[PDB]
From a paper:
Based on sequence alignment, MCR-1 should be a phosphoethanolamine transferase, a member of YhjW/YjdB/YijP superfamily which catalyzes the addition of phosphoethanolamine to lipid A moiety of lipopolysaccharides (LPS) and therefore confers colistin resitance to its host.
To understand the molecular mechanism of colistin resistance and structural features, here we report the X-ray structure of the C-terminal catalytical domain of MCR-1 (aa: 219–541, MCR-1C for short) determined at 1.45 Å resolution. The structure was solved by single-wavelength anomalous scattering (SAD) method using the anomalous signal of zinc ions with well-defined electron density map for all the residues in the construct. The MCR-1C adopted an α/β/α topology with seven β-strands, sandwiched between two layers of α-helices. MCR-1C consists of three disulfide bridges as revealed in the crystal structure (shown as ball-and-stick models). The Cys414-Cys422 bridge stabilized a loop (aa: Lys409-Glu423) located at the top of the protein whereas Cys281-Cys291 completes the catalytic site by locking a smaller α-helix (aa: Thr285-Met292) to the central β sheet. The third disulfide bridge Cys356-Cys364 is only shared between MCR-1C and LptA and it seems to arrest the conformational freedom of the loop (aa: Lys348–365) and facilitate substrate entry. In our study among the three identified zinc ions in MCR-1C, two of them were located at the active site and the third one located near residue Cys291. The phosphorylated Thr285 is considered a catalysis intermediate during phosphate transfer thus stating MCR-1C the first native structure without any bound substrate or reaction intermediate.
Residue numbers in the entry: 219 to 541
Write the structure that this text describes.
């Protein structure tokens, strides 16, 4: 493979300082402007609003507008201005670097797959959580659809199997993917009604489409809160943190545009303006950047490296989500 960080050094090791345990929630289809913290007039993140140490970032722009385009760029060394979607999977990415330096990498997926990101690493480090084969939380809704919270089940066994190592766990959400937003959340999150149901989105009033979308965000609030709560159970033995970033936003009819995937040359703001959250325990010494920092997906790679005390020449000048 073609390297970007052959020089990378982990300055400190888990045998000499506390091991570090991080969950990176790779979000899906979530819009910054539907987040309460960014000024949305509905409380779409009530559980995160009750957790001390959550930072919300109000100015984050995605690389692109589809999962296929954005996800590889989120883990790239190139940044958005330089990213090449066709050669991305055959170049060293940030997970390759962290794995080489001894961080135990796990990717659980309730979306599709890692879009090439995990391809160079052992197959055992990727797990499909879209089916009842691996996901124990699919029977809670009329659609028999497997839920993102299912990805948390059994993570204590992974920690036990990597006892005392640094660990980075990616949880790739179904999140707010459409067009059937109403299917994305269990009935306990049907806060905003009426909702757009059925297979004909044009038959639905705009407000009912928004309602379904916002209900799906409530389920994501819950998932991120449960991810933090899970991390908190390991805080004595590990330095624990959680990063959340959505891969792109979503058009909900603005200017006659729906869904996502619009080429960047024409993409409206709602497809690229994404939420991002960072949480850490007080013991870690990790400090968030200012909430209004002008940020992009280019911040992800340097954040992940910084979380594990890794430096790489190519990202020296790059702003992260953390100091
Ligand atoms: Zn990018
Ligand atoms: Zn999509
Ligand atoms: Zn996506």
């Amino acid at each position: 493979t073609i390297y970007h960080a052959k020089d990378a050094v982990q300055a400190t090791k888990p045998d000499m300082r506390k091991p570090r345990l991080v969950v990176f929630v790779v979000g899906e289809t979530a819009r910054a402007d539907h987040v309460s913290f960014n000024g949305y007039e509905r409380d779409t993140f009530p559980q995160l609003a009750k957790i001390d140490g959550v930072t919300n970032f109000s100015n984050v722009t995605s690389c692109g507008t589809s999962t296929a385009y954005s996800v590889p760029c989120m883990f790239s060394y190139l940044g958005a201005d330089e990213y090449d979607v066709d050669t991305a999977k055959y170049q060293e990415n940030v997970l390759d670097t962290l794995d080489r330096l001894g961080v135990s990498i796990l990717w659980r997926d309730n979306n599709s797959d890692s879009k090439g990101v995990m391809d160079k690493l052992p197959k055992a480090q990727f797990a499909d959580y879209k089916s009842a084969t691996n996901n124990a939380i699919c029977n809670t809704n009329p659609y028999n659809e497997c839920r993102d919270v299912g990805m948390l089940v059994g993570l204590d066994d992974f920690v036990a199997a990597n006892n005392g190592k640094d660990m980075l766990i990616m949880l790739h959400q179904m999140g707010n993917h459409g067009p059937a937003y109403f299917k994305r959340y269990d009935e306990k999150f049907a806060k905003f009604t009426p909702v757009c149901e059925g297979n004909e989105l044009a038959k639905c009033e705009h407000q009912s489409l928004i309602n379904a979308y916002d209900n799906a965000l409530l389920a994501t609030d819950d998932f991120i809160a449960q991810s933090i709560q899970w991390l908190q159970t390991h805080s004595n033995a590990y330095d624990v943190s959680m990063l959340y970033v959505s891969d792109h936003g979503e058009s909900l009819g603005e200017n006659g545009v729906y869904l996502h995937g619009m080429p960047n040359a024409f993409a409206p703001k709602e497809q690229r303006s994404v939420p991002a959250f960072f949480w850490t325990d007080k013991q870690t010494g990790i400090t968030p950047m200012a909430t209004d920092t002008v940020l992009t997906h280019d911040a992800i790679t340097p954040t992940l490296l910084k979380l594990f005390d890794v430096t790489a020449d190519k990202v020296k000048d790059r702003t992260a989500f953390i100091r």
